[PDB]
């Protein structure tokens with residue numbers, strides 16, 4: 001037991017709980033990587049090294065606009081430039097190269113076998129990743145003020161606080177590796193920040209999961225349910241008043257109406 | 265840091281636990297947002 | 306200084322002062338208010354005896370503050386010991402009157418509902434429900450696995466600063482239906498949003 005960890009072999013799961021997969025287990029320099037259903041396959045095993053590289057099949061994950069354009073690929077650590085194979089993982093689920101600051105690891109589609117790319121970082125739910133060996137959605141209740149539970153109301157189209165009822169289906173949420181919070185009874189449906197407003201703040205509702213930057217959330221150590229990246233906002237119970245039936249997206253202040261607990 | 269059970273609901277319990285965390289957790293030393301226990305009081 | 310005093314008062318207005326070692330966050334000793342006796346765990350630090358309740362006659366207990374020792378002395382596991390409002394009231398009472406039969410059980414109740422609750426949000430919230438609904442519960446693997454792995458989770462969090470939020474070792478935690486969740490990184494809300502205080506192991510930074 002030691003506070004320096006040298007290398008670690010784990011998995012990376014992203015959009016729609018799918019995994020980062022080196023396409024058809026290919027070993028060649030320039031073999032491209034795709035989103036694919038998670039399994040124990042060697043090409044879904046990713047090893048992180050203290051040098052900052054992230055590797056499968058003994059080769060390094062890499063991005064270079066001159067050589068590969070927009071596409072993310074595995075390539076030899078000896079051959080490639082040290083700039084192009086170094087990586088950073090953030091608590092909010094962003095995987096990115098420190099040299100290519102505007103860009104972030106992306107899956108432009110939710111479907112399997114889709115080539116992974118380095119797009120412009122909008123902190124979108126298609127740019128959200130969980131590094132870790134447990135890839136499954138984490139299912140629980142989400143508890144706010146007055147020990148009340150978030151409930152999916154109006155045929156899974158709105159969201160607000162109700163008195164907790166154990167094993168009520170509409171009070172169960174599934175937290176996915178992409179940072180989406182999804183209706184347990186319908187996994188095509190995401191907690192989303194709407195265009196509709198209350199007191200000039202976006203109201204939170206349930207819409208179809210579309211991989212936007214309105215449907216990516218991170219549970220932080222401060223007890224907030226927040227948007228990733230800068231210009232951060234938090235989920236909050238409007239006016240600390242459960243009777244308003246309105247959850248809105250507010251500037252973070254860490255008060256009770258912005259505090260939540262995952263009851264798993 | 266007191267807890268009275270006659271004057272006790274969910275809200276006062278949470279406030280009490282909140283104060284224990286305040287007093288035992290470092291004001292400046294945090295990792296990923298999570299406080300490390302204080303070296304002294 | 307090192308020891309954090311803390312008072313709990315029952316429905317019968319009997320109050321006790323409990324001392325916590327800030328280094329481990331463990332209970333070391335306690336005194337019933339207006340009493341000539343105090344009671345120290347067998348493994349209380351030397352400094353506890355030196356500095357706390359020197360006013361009083363310091364008695365040393367038959368067990369230590371580890372969960373195993375407490376379970377052994379209570380004759381039962383944390384997985385069968387009821388928590389809630391009335392259990393806490395009973396526990397405070399039994400410490401106050403120094404009832405030798407029920408001391409270890411009473412400590413298990415108080416430690417979980419105060420110290421373990423302070424460490425984890427999941428435990429805090431479980432206890433808060435028992436207050437609001439006035440309904441007792443028995444901890445299962447979700448609570449127990451958090452209690453047992455706190456030190457290890459704290460270590461892995463510090464260790465994770467050296468390699469992109471990845472743990473040096475797997476921690477085995479459970480959800481409310483007793484399903485295993487093997488955690489090997491900080492990128493799980495059951496760690497990052499749960500752990501409210503961490504044990505110091507190493508001098509690291511984020």
Ligand SMILES: CC(=O)N[C@@H]1[C@@H](O)[C@H](O)[C@@H](CO)O[C@H]1O
Nearest residue numbers: 023032033034112113114115116
């Ligand atoms: C799913 C996908 O994008 N597949 C394409 C494939 O259709 C294309 O012909 C090939 C070049 O051989 O490169 C792959 O990335």
